Design a protein around this ligand. Structure first.
Ligand SMILES: *[C@@H]1O[C@H](CO)[C@@H](O)[C@H](O)[C@H]1NC(C)=O
Ligand SMILES: *[C@@H]1O[C@H](CO)[C@@H](O)[C@H](O)[C@H]1NC(C)=O
Ligand SMILES: *[C@@H]1O[C@H](CO)[C@@H](O)[C@H](O)[C@H]1NC(C)=O
Ligand SMILES: *[C@@H]1O[C@H](CO)[C@@H](O)[C@H](O)[C@H]1NC(C)=O
Ligand SMILES: *[C@@H]1O[C@H](CO)[C@@H](O)[C@H](O)[C@H]1NC(C)=O
Ligand SMILES: *[C@@H]1O[C@H](CO)[C@@H](O)[C@H](O)[C@H]1NC(C)=O
Ligand SMILES: *[C@@H]1O[C@H](CO)[C@@H](O)[C@H](O)[C@H]1NC(C)=O
Lengths: 998, 98, 49, 49, 49
């Protein structure tokens, strides 16, 4: 018993197509990675299944070929392969195998032999009438098991034989056969194959192996970034099936049509009509064994499957040999003169002997049959008229005798009679079908009720799937079902016992795979959304669902991978993924008091980045070329639909013009083009990182170059270039920066008025509530902080790609849409093929019209979806562009007092920079720092008069009282110059006695 | 439930209430200083005086009329609850969304 | 075709957008502030808020 | 077609809610985290808080 | 590769085909197509385009 781990082996090329540096997903028979593979070493029949993976490292070549015959004998066609040193000879011809088929050494294919530490990997498959053989021969290092690595199996040969291949046998050529070959069986699987630039498969991923593999298949990438990914759906399958029809009660009078003790005669056969009853044939089959039971219309079992409105029963007694006359198309006295079945009769003829009951020794002359009639009877007719038969050409004159005989003559039945004249009871059943409601059927069956389990149910003709529980609801007596607000069945009354059973849909929910980056680890956790942990490593139940593979930790961290209602997962470090309640932030209690204030004593100049999309890719679609290509028939058919193509073209043109308007609105704020002076000294402020670099031909700033480096045909689809090139947007950005540096905010509101940069920044400090002396006294420190922040901006942008995640997203979305729009060209949409020329060539025009119509409808719906999605995205981008224009006007051409609009902090000035399809704003902000606690008083009482500060707040260091501005601790002596009286001393609450000088 | 599922929001109602409590505490204890940087202690009457200066009214108006302003604010806050309760259409936007 | 994937992506984008909406509106404060235990704010009454 | 109609309508409603959420974020930053001089942005009258 | 006959791109469109007579690799580019735009001043001004 040798069994080995298959590893990642057995991946072949699905088709003849070449692909380069692409990842392709195929649904095809394959060997699942890490699977159950049998290592073999008298020789029973191995099942071929759908396919076989045969891996032989047999250097001795005891294995010469294979026997794929389904019988291994001369009964059927046996596929026989010989792989000698000369050549491979695939033979199919009829061979008389000897008693021991072994050599000392119709349909034939001779080729170069398959054989050459060789790993002979072979894949044998048989689909759509073709037998496919794939081969691979690779050197292996010293090992007695399958090597670790990846090898692709090139196709070797195809055979058009297409016969049934159930069993395969390894051909024996010598008896102890010890051969070291692995055999595995292929399965229908979905795989993802990575082709290199050389055209070969370097690696593969099996979708249904593990959750990480499923998410790799879903994203079509071998590297999965950190996040939570919705992969599949989870449904609980029905374990059992239940059928419930009402109590079989009432029943067809079958016990009366038989066991009647008298069948009258056959000249006037008793006609019995039966309808509206429960059909049960148990008594019919339980009666005496039948001499003749022939059914002409339906099988006896399937009689119960077929429902008949009208059932006709005809009962009579005839002799033994006259039974053969009661059959369709029979000629004979009884058949033509007593009871004639139709040629296309559909019914059962049941006959059983009645000699034991209806035979009398004296002679039972009651039963009679007719032996003289004027003509043959029409089918299904009863003639009871008995007058003197007129055989003679003379008138009978109502009497009998000469040439005038009685029409009827009786059987004389006596028990001593032999078989062939004994009385036989025949009951002919006739079934009629007519176009009206039926309501007559056979024993409707029923199964035991199953509760609290996902079951299929068919309750009184109502079908469904679900979990059946007891219901508190009380139905009215005549009701059967219960239906909720959405018109879905929620309760059912059981027919057999009147019980109200509630129906609950079986558990279903999404499956999400919480993974760190594939670089960080291969461990994953799985979240079943909305599923109780009972219904599905470490199992944890959360409001989102059931989380398997992550351990709950009491401590709280900042959220990393969102899951649900306050639960986030992270890879913190056996130790693995942990789930926790997310921490909103550090708790800080501000020391509030009646007379305590906190005044900052220093500042920080902080530069932040805000990335805003401005424009999206401009696309134009040629409706005729996309839908139809070069086919004239398709164009003629499209003309009937209307002017849809014109509407789509109008919408796309509108989007394109809107994109141009967006870029103009954001960047064309200034009409003049301003140039910075050649002598670039601005009071210690270094704008080199934002100003253009003359050295490189692009004339872009270092930050702009970094942004462009980071972010950075078909079928009627065209990408129209933007009206403004990147160089023109660079010129606009340079003009805005030069105007801001040289003229402050004056260039936005009129003519540019030059002002030294320190003076401009001092006026911005006045704008944020800080005096000029703060800037002029701390000019070098402010300059150094600004320089350090601008330096750090480059590193912050470069190191973290996610900072530019907005703009890139736009690009990706556009590409994705286009790819979908092209991919749906290959979709069939219910037609024969995606290729219009193939449909036109294979099918006649009248039949091809429907296929082309389906393709046109599908492709036109695809175009409409694309245009609507583009319109929604254009609305979003227009909103972003309007926000960017407002920020350019209010943050770059001016100083804004709006909080959090221009950066985080007290806004000083904003610098624009251009990025592919967007704008990056560098906001410079004043952040207070190093705060100190002081005692404060609303007013100072001097000379019985209150005193309030003109600007600032009254503060105390503990013994002395000063007046200082809010945002910077600059204590000043309280003087009448910085105070105003405004009232007496009694009214104000919290007033402090103190001295005010003059 | 025919394949339609409702995903829970990431932030629970308790967590949003906790953000709202943080915002209110910051506004009451620190004025607008907590938005632009570290939160700085300031007595609430001083904050209202600075807000009066912002709207163009001197500090003496607040300090001299502090009880009146406090009573007016308290009465308005008291009336807000009754006004919301009386007219359901006040919350008609959110309901409509749902 | 791949209509199911497009619809699923659209709904997922909507969901993430809703979470980001709530984050943007409410998560502006970096730290969680607590009001002092003694609630006297110069006669102002914040008990209802 | 029914599902695509639902997704498109829900995307439009998501755009409307996103506009409302951006307005709410702006109002939180400008009215709650500061004093706004913008007329009628934060209530009717001269905005205090 | 010796067994491969067609070539497909990332969009599942044919980009290379092997010549059945002689084994040579032939690249297929789509035949030139584009849109046509007419730049005109107002017909009230002039008729040149
Ligand atoms: C081996 O097979 C080839 C294939 O037809 C055949 O020509 C040759 O005669 C065979 N040789 C032996 C060993 O019989
Ligand atoms: C695959 O491509 C690489 C390209 O660098 C080349 O070095 C290598 O030889 C190729 N392998 C082949 C042709 O088998
Ligand atoms: C059907 O027969 C069962 C046998 O126990 C009985 O309990 C039930 O009441 C019957 N159905 C009706 C509708 O009476
Ligand atoms: C899961 O099932 C248990 C069984 O008692 C129940 O208590 C619990 O409430 C269920 N979970 C949910 C989310 O309803
Ligand atoms: C308070 O400030 C004065 C300056 O006016 C200084 O002389 C004194 O030492 C300081 N002491 C305290 C109480 O902090
Ligand atoms: C301030 O001076 C006045 C003058 O009489 C006095 O009545 C008052 O008590 C002083 N302030 C305090 C807080 O004692
Ligand atoms: C005012 O505050 C008191 C406690 O200080 C409280 O009981 C009362 O309800 C408040 N009134 C309001 C908010 O109208």
């Amino acid at each position: 018993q040798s069994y080995t781990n298959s590893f990642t082996r057995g991946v072949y090329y699905p088709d003849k197509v070449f692909r380069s540096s692409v990842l392709h997903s195929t649904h095809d028979l394959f060997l699942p990675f890490f699977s159950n593979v049998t290592w073999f070493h008298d020789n029973p029949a191995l099942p071929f299944n759908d396919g076989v993976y045969f891996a032989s490292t047999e250097k001795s070549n005891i294995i010469r070929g294979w026997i794929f015959g389904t019988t291994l004998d001369s009964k059927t066609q046996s596929l026989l392969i010989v792989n000698n040193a000369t050549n491979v000879v695939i033979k199919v011809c009829e061979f008389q195998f000897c008693n021991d088929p072994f050599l000392d050494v119709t349909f034939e294919y001779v080729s170069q032999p398959f054989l050459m530490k060789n790993l002979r990997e072979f894949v044998f498959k048989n689909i759509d009438g073709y037998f496919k053989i794939y081969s691979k021969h690779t050197p292996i290092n010293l090992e007695r098991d399958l090597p670790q690595g990846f090898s692709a199996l090139e196709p070797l040969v195809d055979l058009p034989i297409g016969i049934n291949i159930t069993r395969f046998q390894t051909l024996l050529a010598l008896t102890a056969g010890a051969a070291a070959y692995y055999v595995g069986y292929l399965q229908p699987r979905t795989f993802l194959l990575k082709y290199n630039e050389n055209g070969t498969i370097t690696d593969a991923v099996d979708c249904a192996l593990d959750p990480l593999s499923e998410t790799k298949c879903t994203l079509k990438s071998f590297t999965v970034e950190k996040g939570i990914y919705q992969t599949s759906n989870f449904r609980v399958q029905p374990t059992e099936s239940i059928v419930r029809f009402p109590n079989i009660t009432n029943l067809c009078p079958f016990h009366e049509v038989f066991n009647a003790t008298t069948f009258a005669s056959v000249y006037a056969w008793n006609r019995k009509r039966i309808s509206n009853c429960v059909a049960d044939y148990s008594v019919i089959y339980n009666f005496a064994p039948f001499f003749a039971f022939k059914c002409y219309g339906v099988s006896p079992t399937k009689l119960n499957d077929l429902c008949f409105t009208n059932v006709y029963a005809d009962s009579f007694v005839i002799r033994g040999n006259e039974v053969s006359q009661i059959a369709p198309g029979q000629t004979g006295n009884i058949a033509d003169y007593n009871y004639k079945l139709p040629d296309d009769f559909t019914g059962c003829v049941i006959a059983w002997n009645s000699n034991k009951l209806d035979s009398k020794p004296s002679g039972n002359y009651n039963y009679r049959y007719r032996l003289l009639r004027k003509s043959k009877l029409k089918p299904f007719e009863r003639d009871i008229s008995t007058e003197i038969y007129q055989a003679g050409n003379k008138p009978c004159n109502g009497v009998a005798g000469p040439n005038c005989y009685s029409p009827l003559q009786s059987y004389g039945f006596r028990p001593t009679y032999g078989v062939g004249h004994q009385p036989y009871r025949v009951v002919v059943l006739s079934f009629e079908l007519l176009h009206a409601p039926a309501t007559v059927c056979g024993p409707k069956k029923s199964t035991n009720l199953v509760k609290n389990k996902c079951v299929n149910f068919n309750f009184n003709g109502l079908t469904g799937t679900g979990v059946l529980t007891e219901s508190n609801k009380k139905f009215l007596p005549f009701q059967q079902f219960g239906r909720d607000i959405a018109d879905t069945t929620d309760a059912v009354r059981d027919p057999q016992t009147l019980e109200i059973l509630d129906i609950t849909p079986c558990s279903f929910g999404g499956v999400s795979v919480i993974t760190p980056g594939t670089n960080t680890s291969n461990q994953v956790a799985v979240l079943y959304q909305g599923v109780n942990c009972t219904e599905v490593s470490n199992v944890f139940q959360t409001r989102a669902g059931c989380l398997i593979g992550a351990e709950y930790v009491n401590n709280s961290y900042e959220c990393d991978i969102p899951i649900g209602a306050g639960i986030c997962a992270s890879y913190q470090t056996s130790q693995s993924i942990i789930a926790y309640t997310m921490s909103l932030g550090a708790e800080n209690s501000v020391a509030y008091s009646n007379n305590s204030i906190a005044i900052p004593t220093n500042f920080t100049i902080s530069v932040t980045t805000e990335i805003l999309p401005v424009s999206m890719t401009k696309t134009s679609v040629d409706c005729t070329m996309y839908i139809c290509g070069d086919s004239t028939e398709c164009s003629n058919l499209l003309l009937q639909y209307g002017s849809f193509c014109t509407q789509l073209k109008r919408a796309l043109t509108g989007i394109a013009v809107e994109q141009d308007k967006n870029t103009q609105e954001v960047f064309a704020q200034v009409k003049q083009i301003y140039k910075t002076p050649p002598i670039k000294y601005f009071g210690g402020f270094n704008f080199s990182q934002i100003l253009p670099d003359p050295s490189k031909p692009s004339k872009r700033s270092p930050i702009e170059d970094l942004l462009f480096n980071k972010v950075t045909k078909f079928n009627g689809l065209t990408v129209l270039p933007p009206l403004l090139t990147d160089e023109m947007i660079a010129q606009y950005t340079s003009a805005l920066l030069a105007g801001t540096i040289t003229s402050g905010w004056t260039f936005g509101a009129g003519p540019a008025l030059q002002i030294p940069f320190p003076m401009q920044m001092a006026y911005r400090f006045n704008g944020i509530g800080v005096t000029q002396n703060v800037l002029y006294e701390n000019q070098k420190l402010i300059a150094n902080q600004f320089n350090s922040a601008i330096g750090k901006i480059q590193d912050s942008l470069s190191s973290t790609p996610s900072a530019l995640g907005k703009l890139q997203d736009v690009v990706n979305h556009n590409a994705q849409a286009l790819n979908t729009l092209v991919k749906q060209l290959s979709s069939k949409f219910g037609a024969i093929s995606s290729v219009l020329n193939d449909i036109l060539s294979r099918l006649d025009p009248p039949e091809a019209e429907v296929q082309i119509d389906r393709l046109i409808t599908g492709r036109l719906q695809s175009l409409q979806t694309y245009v609507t999605q583009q319109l929604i995205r254009a609305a979003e981008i227009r909103a972003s562009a309007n926000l960017a224009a407002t920020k350019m006007s209010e943050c770059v051409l001016g100083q804004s007092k709006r909080v959090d609009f221009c950066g985080k902090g007290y806004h000083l000035m904003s610098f624009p920079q251009s990025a592919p399809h967007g704008v990056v704003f560098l906001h410079v902000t004043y952040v207070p720092a190093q705060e100190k606690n002081f005692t404060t008083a609303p007013a100072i009482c001097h000379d019985g008069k209150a005193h309030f500060p003109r600007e600032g707040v009254f503060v105390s260091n503990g013994t002395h009282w000063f007046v200082t501005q809010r945002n910077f601790y600059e204590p000043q002596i309280i003087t009448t110059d910085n105070t105003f009286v405004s009232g007496n001393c009694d009214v104000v609450i919290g007033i402090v006695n103190n001295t005010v000088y003059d």
